[PDB]
Amino acid sequence: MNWTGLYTLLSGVNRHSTAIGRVWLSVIFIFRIMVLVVAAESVWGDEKSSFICNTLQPGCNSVCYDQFFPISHVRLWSLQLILVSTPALLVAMHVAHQQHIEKKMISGTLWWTYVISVVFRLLFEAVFMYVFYLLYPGYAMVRLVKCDVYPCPNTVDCFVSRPTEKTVFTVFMLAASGICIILNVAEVVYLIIRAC
Amino acid sequence: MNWTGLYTLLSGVNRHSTAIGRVWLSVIFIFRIMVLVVAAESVWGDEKSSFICNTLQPGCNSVCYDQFFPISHVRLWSLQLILVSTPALLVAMHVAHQQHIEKKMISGTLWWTYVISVVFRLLFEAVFMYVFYLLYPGYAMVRLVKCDVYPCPNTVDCFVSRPTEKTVFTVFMLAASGICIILNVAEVVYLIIRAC
Amino acid sequence: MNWTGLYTLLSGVNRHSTAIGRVWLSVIFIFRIMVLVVAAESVWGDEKSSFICNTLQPGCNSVCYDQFFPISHVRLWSLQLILVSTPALLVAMHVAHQQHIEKKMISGTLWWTYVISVVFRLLFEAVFMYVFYLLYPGYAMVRLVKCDVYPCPNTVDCFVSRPTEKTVFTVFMLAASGICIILNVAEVVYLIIRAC
Amino acid sequence: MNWTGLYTLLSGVNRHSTAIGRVWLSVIFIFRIMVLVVAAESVWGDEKSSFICNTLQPGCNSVCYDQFFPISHVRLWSLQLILVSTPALLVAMHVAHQQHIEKKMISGTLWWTYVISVVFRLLFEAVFMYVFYLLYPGYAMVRLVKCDVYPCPNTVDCFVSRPTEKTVFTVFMLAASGICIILNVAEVVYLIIRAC
Amino acid sequence: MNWTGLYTLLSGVNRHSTAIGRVWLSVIFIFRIMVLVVAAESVWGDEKSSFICNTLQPGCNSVCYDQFFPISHVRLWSLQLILVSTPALLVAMHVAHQQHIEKKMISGTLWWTYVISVVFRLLFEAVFMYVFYLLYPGYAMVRLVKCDVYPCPNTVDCFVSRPTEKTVFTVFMLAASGICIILNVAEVVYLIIRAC
Amino acid sequence: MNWTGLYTLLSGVNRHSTAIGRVWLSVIFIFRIMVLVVAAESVWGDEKSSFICNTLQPGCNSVCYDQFFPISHVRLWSLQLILVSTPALLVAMHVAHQQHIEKKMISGTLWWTYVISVVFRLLFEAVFMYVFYLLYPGYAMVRLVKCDVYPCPNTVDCFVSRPTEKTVFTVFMLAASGICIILNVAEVVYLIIRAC
Ligand SMILES: CCCCCCCC/C=C\CCCCCCCC(=O)O[C@@H](COC(=O)CCCCCCCCCCCCCCC)COP(=O)([O-])OCC[N+](C)(C)C
Ligand SMILES: CCCCCCCC/C=C\CCCCCCCC(=O)O[C@@H](COC(=O)CCCCCCCCCCCCCCC)COP(=O)([O-])OCC[N+](C)(C)C
Ligand SMILES: CCCCCCCC/C=C\CCCCCCCC(=O)O[C@@H](COC(=O)CCCCCCCCCCCCCCC)COP(=O)([O-])OCC[N+](C)(C)C
Ligand SMILES: CCCCCCCC/C=C\CCCCCCCC(=O)O[C@@H](COC(=O)CCCCCCCCCCCCCCC)COP(=O)([O-])OCC[N+](C)(C)C
Ligand SMILES: CCCCCCCC/C=C\CCCCCCCC(=O)O[C@@H](COC(=O)CCCCCCCCCCCCCCC)COP(=O)([O-])OCC[N+](C)(C)C
Ligand SMILES: CCCCCCCC/C=C\CCCCCCCC(=O)O[C@@H](COC(=O)CCCCCCCCCCCCCCC)COP(=O)([O-])OCC[N+](C)(C)C
Ligand SMILES: CC(C)CCC[C@@H](C)[C@H]1CC[C@H]2[C@@H]3CC=C4C[C@@H](O)CC[C@]4(C)[C@H]3CC[C@]12C
Ligand SMILES: CC(C)CCC[C@@H](C)[C@H]1CC[C@H]2[C@@H]3CC=C4C[C@@H](O)CC[C@]4(C)[C@H]3CC[C@]12C
Ligand SMILES: CC(C)CCC[C@@H](C)[C@H]1CC[C@H]2[C@@H]3CC=C4C[C@@H](O)CC[C@]4(C)[C@H]3CC[C@]12C
Ligand SMILES: CC(C)CCC[C@@H](C)[C@H]1CC[C@H]2[C@@H]3CC=C4C[C@@H](O)CC[C@]4(C)[C@H]3CC[C@]12C
Ligand SMILES: CC(C)CCC[C@@H](C)[C@H]1CC[C@H]2[C@@H]3CC=C4C[C@@H](O)CC[C@]4(C)[C@H]3CC[C@]12C
């Protein structure tokens, strides 16, 4: 398990990515993976069970939790990571397939494929950031949430678990996503400039 | 752990699959595996325990859960993934066995085996999609379910846990399955066209 | 991790097994392993805790569960898998030992060892299927079980958890076991025919 | 991960073990490891929590459990496995060290070391079997246990969890241990006979 | 898995780090990783559930825990470890990329990159130590905490779980962080001295 | 995964350790690791939750547990193992670094480093054994503990969970630590004798 092997695995051996997408984007991806691993089960592990309301009606806790957390932050970030990494995996499979098909018996198509992949990665990053903004306005979470949804009578007080720790990890993940967006835009601009 | 090794492992080294079954189907399979891993235990982990009814009769929770969830979505998708991956595993074992048997001492039979394997994969995809449609009509889950089954008296209100997150992951998995079906049909059509 | 290595590992390099025991039996074994892994802890994870009776006497739940589930399906299938795989492991160790002992300084004894191994595998499959039939008549599980055993007073109503999902997985595992039995019988018959 | 590598790893490359200690003892060790893995957490996972008494005094459950289960079966078998495998590990380290020390610049001492190792393995097997007999007379477990120990007033009825499944696995592990004892005795006798 | 491979992996093959950053810093990093692994889930596993207050108001436990533990020690140390290891990963990726780019067709820039990386590692260590000082003044934790925050009426007594064990592990981790800071300062000073 | 590789990894390739530190100390380390793994989560898993007192005051359980178990046995043994293994890791990194630095362009310094490492390992073993003696006098644990600490009124009866199993594992770990101390002293004496 040497450094050259890991670097080659993360690069995708596409021979078209510059330093800002082969040295920095991979590091940010590793950072996001590590943060998600260390915060997925320890922080958001008991987001459902430790979440309680101040009512006595049965079934109000579940409906309140689903009302205020349509999809938890960790699952949203996992989906974002998978969809962001999908185009890189596609490019890696494309270049491996091209090497295989030329082994049994080209630059421009690979260049266009890589550019389209970076554009799609940027698009997925922006889409997931916008979805996060829609579902959870603001970067901070509050302890008290007032919920008025059936079967809860009138408005009940539900209490979120670990709002501050979740706020800290939200800040970290949003900063990492913003850095990824900036790096992808820089990579696209650099490729366009070098093409012309 | 290089890209060529992973690509060769996913391809099955059958030397008969085109790009739409060697570069795209493997990526969709990886996507489904990753989504199932990140949603199997975090979302559907407490589908039984967090599921409560509004009655006082003992044993009504279990019978209601079994009535409304004959087999949970994650287990159904796991079975679908296993049965879809079975023909690819069979073709890989067949080609490995053929290489071994020719090493100790052919194209048409392998071509027919691959075509039959793709047909069976498409059939399994369609069968599991139809079963999902039968068991759970619609792509969305509801918070309230009215259950009238012994021993629950009359009709009781049971509350599902995380209907919206499960709806999101159901949409993702159904979209992936539809993409797999389309790719399999395209692969079969392309092979038939190239044969003639 | 190439396909040739996995195929050689699953074959046992005994140079006496045909396609129906080197390409198909290994695939069925992998299928059983995967189904057991995906159903061992998710389905049968809370078979004891979610199992409740309708009485108030302490200790009735445990005695009722032990009365109706002498050994759970997952553990029974795990024992069946281990005992079925034991003769294959023995043959692999035998052939490895033979290669080692001939390296420091034969076909008929290996052929007889393989035939005896297949016979013992078939015998273990049949024995475990018969034991499953004895303990749990029928392929289906019921929600209500009437238990009359000390200390439970008179007859109490215990409620099984997820009878339908367990029925589905029981059907899958029994079908796989039947396929294994048929393949083993076919392998024995083919070897006997080729010998004569 | 080939068969020759696994066989060499399990053999210990001591060049003094016959077939009954290089092909059979390793298989029985693998069988015991697999059974212990599949029964360690699923069966004995909730031996403490599902264990309840019929009293109302606080702290009676813990003292009763410690009174009737001084050390649980799984931990006892794990300790037995570790201590039985210790002499084999010692012999493997000895032969590796001898190869290293002869590489930088003998049969009789290795033979005596192997014989002493087999004797110690047999002794550990017998000691652990005798300890199991002392702590838990009989191969079967009972649902009701009558406990009269402070602070429990008079005699209370505690209920064991899954006595029948634990009985089945006890039978399996004791049979495996007996087979190991017989094989070790046979190996010692065979080595002594071949020496003279 | 030899020692040379592990040493090369931990060094980063930057050919500019002395013994006090290639032999000692890696050992301290391994020590911190191991302590964090052995204390992450066993000690801080039930910091939320075992944490209880002496009130009867619903939702007071969660708000009190979030008030006194904005971000738990284990997550803070995990973030510190990730951010401290980020510059080393960046330097490793930089040197791998430089080797790759010179393979398809320099000392001063690598030296400056390594110096900047060590400076940033020291800065992150100091920042996280200061944050730990701000959030949790003192190295010791107390059993009683007096909390007066909505909705808890007046001042309630909350009880932390395992204050002494957490204090011991806090002392260990703070000592390791201080050693890391000292080693980084020594490395910077040594590099500056050798440059001039 | 051969035996020579594992032996080389455990030895540290320091070319100065005799048989009593290269064949026996590594085996005892493996034994301690295995015992700690098989007893860390099964025995000491529920030391906090199954621990209950005979009072009604809230928060008395946590303060009593922290009073009688300042740091649990498993965590203490894990810290002891990490600190004992630290000097061996340091020597391995030192010898790897020396090989690297001589590769790009000595016996006495390595000998002194190894001797100092063995002395420090012995010192850490003795320190941790003395700490264990201070915290938990005697090798045995008792079911009843009388606790008189705020907020518990007067003296309350707390009940430890599995005292006998924990006593057995304490005996095993203390015996292993004593064997390690004896072996380290023997190694130091042998090295001193051979030097003179
Ligand atoms: C479905 C769940 C997915 C989760 C998300 C995964 C996300 C990503 C995570 C992980 C992906 C892999 C990360 C490490 C990659 C290192 C590659 C490397 O260095 O290769 C090199 C070394 O390679 C080897 O010799 C073997 C390296 C083993 C890598 C790990 C194997 C599987 C680990 C299982 C872990 C289980 C636990 C995982 C968590 C459950 C290549 O070899 P080489 O000698 O250089 O080649 C010849 C030299 N020459 C080329 C110069 C001629
Ligand atoms: C029963 C549960 C099943 C679950 C579903 C599984 C679904 C699928 C998941 C996983 C299947 C495997 C995925 C990775 C495959 C990579 C293969 C590869 O790159 O091979 C290459 C590198 O190979 C190596 O050098 C070693 C690579 C190790 C792969 C992982 C080993 C086991 C990981 C255990 C993980 C534990 C945790 C897993 C979760 C519990 C081949 O080597 P090469 O150097 O290229 O060969 C010579 C070069 N030449 C050919 C050009 C001449
Ligand atoms: C006690 C619990 C037991 C559970 C039940 C187990 C049931 C069975 C499950 C698993 C058994 C193993 C399955 C995979 C086997 C692949 C073998 C292979 O391809 O070998 C090849 C590649 O080999 C390599 O280069 C390394 C492959 C690593 C395999 C996984 C290692 C351990 C994974 C740990 C996972 C941890 C998690 C597991 C779950 C906790 C051989 O190499 P080659 O390059 O071909 O050789 C030279 C080439 N030539 C021969 C042509 C000259
Ligand atoms: C502390 C906890 C302890 C638990 C109890 C353990 C009990 C025992 C369990 C396990 C011990 C190991 C069992 C498998 C051994 C296979 C060895 C083998 O085949 O070697 C061969 C292949 O080797 C390879 O190429 C790599 C094989 C990887 C083996 C697994 C690595 C670690 C898995 C981690 C799993 C993580 C999960 C584990 C559970 C948490 C040797 O290579 P070769 O190519 O033959 O060499 C050259 C060829 N020539 C010699 C002919 C010239
Ligand atoms: C996302 C979660 C991240 C968690 C934090 C991770 C933190 C860090 C943790 C871990 C990082 C890795 C630590 C071990 C590195 C050893 C490297 C080594 O010795 O390489 C050598 C051997 O290499 C091999 O032959 C294979 C070694 C396999 C290493 C482990 C693979 C993945 C394990 C998965 C574990 C799963 C469980 C993990 C926990 C879930 C290199 O090979 P060589 O033969 O020397 O090369 C040719 C020789 N020549 C160069 C002289 C010509
Ligand atoms: C942070 C948590 C830490 C926990 C505490 C750890 C404590 C310690 C535990 C573990 C440390 C490692 C123990 C096994 C070491 C075997 C080394 C070996 O045999 O090397 C040999 C084989 O090497 C290979 O070919 C690969 C062997 C893979 C070893 C395991 C990799 C990671 C497993 C991940 C497990 C995941 C689960 C782990 C639990 C979560 C070297 O190769 P070779 O062919 O001999 O080299 C060329 C031959 N020649 C030199 C003669 C020319
Ligand atoms: C520039 C950045 C984004 C590059 C990131 C590379 C990512 C997308 C690549 C590099 C290595 C890849 C992994 C390599 C191997 C496997 C094992 C396979 O069974 C599932 C997919 C999985 C886990 C891949 C997922 C995608 C992956 C993580
Ligand atoms: C075209 C697409 C569908 C190809 C997908 C390839 C799939 C079916 C193949 C590729 C690699 C295969 C895996 C390779 C090795 C193992 C280990 C073995 O002990 C169990 C089966 C398992 C886990 C295989 C399952 C099937 C598998 C995942
Ligand atoms: C024809 C079919 C049935 C062949 C199936 C082969 C089976 C029985 C063989 C192939 C590879 C084998 C595995 C190879 C390596 C190990 C690691 C060892 O530490 C425990 C046993 C274990 C896990 C073996 C169990 C048995 C095994 C799974
Ligand atoms: C004849 C029979 C009894 C032989 C059995 C061989 C046993 C004792 C040997 C073979 C391989 C060995 C394992 C090889 C490697 C490791 C990794 C190390 O970090 C801990 C010990 C451990 C896990 C060893 C334990 C002992 C072991 C399992
Ligand atoms: C001088 C000291 C600080 C050096 C420490 C080196 C650290 C930062 C390096 C060495 C090896 C690296 C690991 C090597 C491989 C992987 C697998 C990848 O999928 C995620 C990142 C991860 C897990 C790396 C994280 C960073 C790492 C641990």
Ligand SMILES: CC(C)CCC[C@@H](C)[C@H]1CC[C@H]2[C@@H]3CC=C4C[C@@H](O)CC[C@]4(C)[C@H]3CC[C@]12C
């Ligand atoms: C004589 C006896 C004491 C020798 C014992 C050797 C010990 C100290 C050595 C041998 C192999 C080493 C391991 C090898 C590799 C790794 C992976 C790394 O990411 C963390 C440290 C870790 C897990 C090491 C810890 C220390 C270790 C276990």
